[PDB]
Symmetry: D3
Subunit: 278 residues, 6 copies
Amino acid sequence: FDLPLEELKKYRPERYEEKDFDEFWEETLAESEKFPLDPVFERMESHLKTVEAYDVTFSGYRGQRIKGWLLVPKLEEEKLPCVVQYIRGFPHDWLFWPSMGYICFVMDTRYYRRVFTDAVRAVEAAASFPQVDQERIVIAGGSQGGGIALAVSALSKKAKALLCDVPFLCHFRRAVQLVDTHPYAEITNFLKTHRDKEEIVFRTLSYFDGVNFAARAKIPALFSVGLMDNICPPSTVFAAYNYYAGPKEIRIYPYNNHEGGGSFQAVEQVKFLKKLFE
Amino acid sequence: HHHMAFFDLPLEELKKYRPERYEEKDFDEFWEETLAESEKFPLDPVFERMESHLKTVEAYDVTFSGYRGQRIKGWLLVPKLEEEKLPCVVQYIRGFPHDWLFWPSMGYICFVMDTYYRRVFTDAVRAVEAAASFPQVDQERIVIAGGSQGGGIALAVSALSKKAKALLCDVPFLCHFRRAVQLVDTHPYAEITNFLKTHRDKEEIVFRTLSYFDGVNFAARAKIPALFSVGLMDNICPPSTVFAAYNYYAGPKEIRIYPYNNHEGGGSFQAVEQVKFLKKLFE
Amino acid sequence: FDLPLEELKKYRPERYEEKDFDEFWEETLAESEKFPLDPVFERMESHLKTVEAYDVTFSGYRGQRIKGWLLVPKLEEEKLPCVVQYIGRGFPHDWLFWPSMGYICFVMDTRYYRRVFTDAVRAVEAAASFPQVDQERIVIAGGSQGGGIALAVSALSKKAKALLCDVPFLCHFRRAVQLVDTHPYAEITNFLKTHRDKEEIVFRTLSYFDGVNFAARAKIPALFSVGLMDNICPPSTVFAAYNYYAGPKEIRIYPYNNHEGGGSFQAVEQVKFLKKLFE
Amino acid sequence: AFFDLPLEELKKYRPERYEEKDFDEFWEETLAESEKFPLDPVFERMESHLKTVEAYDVTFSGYRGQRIKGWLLVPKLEEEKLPCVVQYIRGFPHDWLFWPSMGYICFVMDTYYRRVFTDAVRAVEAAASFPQVDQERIVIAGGSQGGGIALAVSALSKKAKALLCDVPFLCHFRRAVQLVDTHPYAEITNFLKTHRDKEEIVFRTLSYFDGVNFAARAKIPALFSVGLMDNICPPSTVFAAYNYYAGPKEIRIYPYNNHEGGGSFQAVEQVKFLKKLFE
Amino acid sequence: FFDLPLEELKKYRPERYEEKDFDEFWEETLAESEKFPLDPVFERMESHLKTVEAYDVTFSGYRGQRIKGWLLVPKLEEEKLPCVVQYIRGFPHDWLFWPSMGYICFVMDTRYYRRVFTDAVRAVEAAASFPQVDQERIVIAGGSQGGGIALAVSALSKKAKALLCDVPFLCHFRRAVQLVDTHPYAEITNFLKTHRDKEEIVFRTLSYFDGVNFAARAKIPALFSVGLMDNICPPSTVFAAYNYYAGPKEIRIYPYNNHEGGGSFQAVEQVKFLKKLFE
Amino acid sequence: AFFDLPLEELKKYRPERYEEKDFDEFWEETLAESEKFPLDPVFERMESHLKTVEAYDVTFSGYRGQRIKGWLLVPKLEEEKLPCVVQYIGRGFPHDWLFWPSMGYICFVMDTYYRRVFTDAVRAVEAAASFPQVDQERIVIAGGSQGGGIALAVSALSKKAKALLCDVPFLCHFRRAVQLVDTHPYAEITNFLKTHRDKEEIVFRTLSYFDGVNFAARAKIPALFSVGLMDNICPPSTVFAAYNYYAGPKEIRIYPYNNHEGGGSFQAVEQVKFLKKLFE
């Protein structure tokens, strides 16, 4: 259903952002940095044997006390690499990264101004665990999470690599004219009833568009895209990917919908991060 | 076609639901004879350590003899723990080894078998023997587990395997065929219906044949402790089919009921319930 | 989804009809009999080898010239039994079943029910006028809308001798509408959704065309069929008409079938039924 | 099509109610907290293309003193006191022409449920503060989410004099969830599908907002409507509320309608009801 | 978005197909129906409405048959009022918009297209005959099937002065059929699926009723609307008619809407358009 | 509605073919292997209510000598020799296959991995040809959908077949089908690849042995194809690829408003006409 692959690879649409895009975000982060982070780790009761689990409390947007999980694999190593993973379920749903030898910080998004700020702070919280190797802090997400990660790749001093799967929050004006699926269809359904608010909806969403963070992000990244994904259509993902200003690679799954590369792509990430961190 | 919400018998009645069973006079002879035939080939389990990015778990590519001696495949996932003897879950479905991290992460060796039902059930009985042959496996704590088609398979195995010690049976398929068919238009039970739509004269023979694979009939025979789960909005494996099997199940048993879930069942919540159940059982 | 079978077999709901149900139909047929039938059979050029095909024209409702096909199997016999089949009338080769089993087949093109039923009663007269047709063995047949039509004809035609009625539409309207949301019964429901004040008049009008009310009148032998998963023509509607049907009768029950009914299996049942009947 | 209890049984359906010991204390306290801020209604005449109606942008204090908005539509009639319908949903002022056209001043409030119900109670107080409003003839009305809200307001507002409750949402949550997979009741289900351990707390929390519990308390006259094929707000949910409703009451039943209810037919029924009531 | 992009829709002028007798056919159709006197009859109706007077209208349409309509007159000082003939008839209260904006509203009950278009041309003449109607300000209006009808009327009526045409059906048939599988254009497709040999005759027949061909003839000012996600009446069909439309014109484009079009927002655009036009 | 290439472009659509270097060795070898067992056709007259047609239950050896079943329907006509349609598909009831016998053709209906099925189908022609009343100069092979795909393969593999009727065929231009439609049966391939992301090359190389396009390029017998321009089971660009590569004398009937039903009863008559013009 979207542009052919030859053209997706060369797709660089005109970007829309306000003159204050950077002033808005610098100011948002400054406001929330005025409160100390005060990370608190609580060991939690778990049936898990290969992993230790912590309930983490930290200061996010405007000093509010947010929480995340910290999953630490039981390994000899005094210092471990770390994946901050954005979305929740159970701690046992996040076993992949710890099982591959990474500490995993799992943060649920509890508007985007608040969520992105919380997420930036989550990296700071993870970094503050003494076992975490700060040179190997990775940020990751798929869908809404991939969109959030992508923003964080431009906003976080501490993050060192990005794993961005099938991201949402990318190239809003194009998404809306290609698919009638949730979540992009919420915008369309808003505009259907507020016919006079097209300029303001899109000017507002421009502050949260992944394409605009991508153009700014300088850290290495691995993207994934499903060529049959009609939740997060390929032209949206390729727009962000192609504008992404750091060293990058994309794994293209031509027969997949929004599941993306699934478990195959998980292994690709492990391989990518291994090559990166040696 | 999908039911809107609750569509089967109410819960008060599901708990008392014990329909008449149908089986042939030779049900036991058929399965004894099938297993004897396949035991005439040596199991010859082969475990190959695999190169893996996994750090908490060691992974083996397993080959073993199943139905009529055919070389079947499985994964073995062993969590890296001090213990010289570990408990073991044989899980029926094979994707990546990293898809099966749950049980190893909870301290269980995990044997994952790659999956007509004559062949599959025999393969599955043999997978337990394969798993038991790993020296680190504690044979007093071998568990059999499955959801859907896997759950139906596990249920059969609970009645056919000398070696299995406990059953985890989630939202099982292969149960109470005659009723499934008159409640749901969903795959997989709808394959039976579509067959009968076209072969109008084969009702007796379709149901007599299926009786040999019906989980209700194995349940009536199974003596090992078991934990079942069911989704009351499950329109793939409707609740009356699962409750039929659960209620006939002849070993010590419990069921977790998920009133708002479709075929996902209790999902991750139920995974924890299984860990708790097995802990209480084996301590 | 409907009543269980034990109950379907005993299901006899109260009937509704207007005081002039019979006068209405008598009068409708008399009006259309005031024009001569004037059946015209034209041999058609056909690729068919086992069958001869005629383009038929005859006078139906109010004298309008209706069209049909006649298919005659090439057989020794000077006199052949005949099935009048109701459905448009597609190709002659679509109607090979009955001729292939040794029956002349008259296939009537459908074109409101006042007209269609009248057209259909006249089709039997057209078919009876073919010299090779044995008038003692004229059968009327239809499935769906056809079955409903055939059912009406079983009560309105002097000439018809047996009925084949499969999964019939036009039966027990008020119950249908409260069991299924499928076309065609859902047209009634959608009308009433919008015309909330027209319930009485819709149902009274439809009572003139309800197969249950014809069934109560029909005296000729009949074979019905029903699919227990049929959500176009639900089982309780078919069983209502079947149970009220006043002639010698049988029903074939297909428990796993939807509106396809007994399909090809049922087609053979019909052949068997008619063979047993006409010896 | 029909999927809920039959009508005989719907009319007698009175399920056990669940509410917390503090249901009344919770609401008394919520309203007291919001009454500690002055209402301070402000009416701004608006430039409008309308010729039969005058339109005001209304600002008032709702929940916790927040400045809420509504429309006031006044029909141009040479009467100094008019009856009034407070209608809960805000689109254009021209979307709300029905009540003004029937001679009623119409207050349309732009609409967690703690905040919304409190805002809605205060919208009556805002409407009553318009000098042209006849306080003896203040009516509260809603369909869907609006009907639920109106139902709560019928129990919580000193000032309201009658209730028009169509196809209400926010009723008999535990039952809705086990009958339908449609939005909005399916949000509850989708929550519980994921938070399997939160059934008791979800339903105890929702008990503070259940229309059945407000209905048991409401003393003002009311006209309800229900669609027997409504799978958004299933009939057993509406009938539970209707049957527990403690004021003088009537229900209009639309057997062939889904969530559209009686539509325009029902609108006229309301006009008739209110006319009979207020004379 | 599934049709041509907007830059290309604005320039879209496909080849038109009409028969050599398009004009003779319509002239002759209207002459035939003018041979019967219009004989408009207005009956004041008992109504709960207070801002509007309602009349039950009867008039002679196609071939002299007595067609029905509603006339809604807003109670205003003015001795002469402008008038919107609206094509679709439900309740009078469903048509409050135009009277509430100061326009008399003639709502015509739609009952083939030969008959409906002729009825609709005659409705304008019926409306014009009401003494309070200002004949210099008679507007014709419709959405969907109504828009298609209004469009025809814009070319066929001596007395109409402006056109409001929203999301019209009956436009650029051959293209519709290859873009969408939705009702109503899919009735054409389903016919052709079965009558494979009737392509020429189906399209030649439909050419007499195609809005594109009327548009090319219509000389009165018009406001069109289109939804760029409308898959009932696809944008390329509407733009074909709009672009051929031979009078002074404007189009309001709603990029995120389906067949609802501009809805209430577009209703206000019409009021504005007509105000600017008539002063 | 219309979702594939336009017609002007469908008519010129000749995509690059892919096949393995052993395509022909594979099929020659497969057929030789199955010819090493004797056909041994057995015709049993069946009790039938039919009066214009005689019906036989047929048994014959197909793939690797397995005993396959078919129906033979013979119209009761004076003629000592009759033309024959081998029709590929339940083989349902004998009465479901009345069209061809009614038009004066003997009909062999075969009850239908593809290696096995194609071999069975090639052998069905030999079974039909062994009936003494069959005219071997007028043996026709026919199928729609899966049947049309099978018939297409048989048009290249059978010494005995003389004409092909290929309607809305499945098994054609796999790599394109998969990127145009999400319908069964082509969607089984897509679903396989969604899960086995590393098996694209081997899936498509394997399927190349069964692709109707590749048989078409080889088939030398005359043929009538049909296509539905709204067919989203067997999309038009797949059918046109096979049709356009088809190397024998050919025609195609194009049904612009039809989905997978194709030309239906109208096309049936087109076939009769085609075969009549051909065999005189």
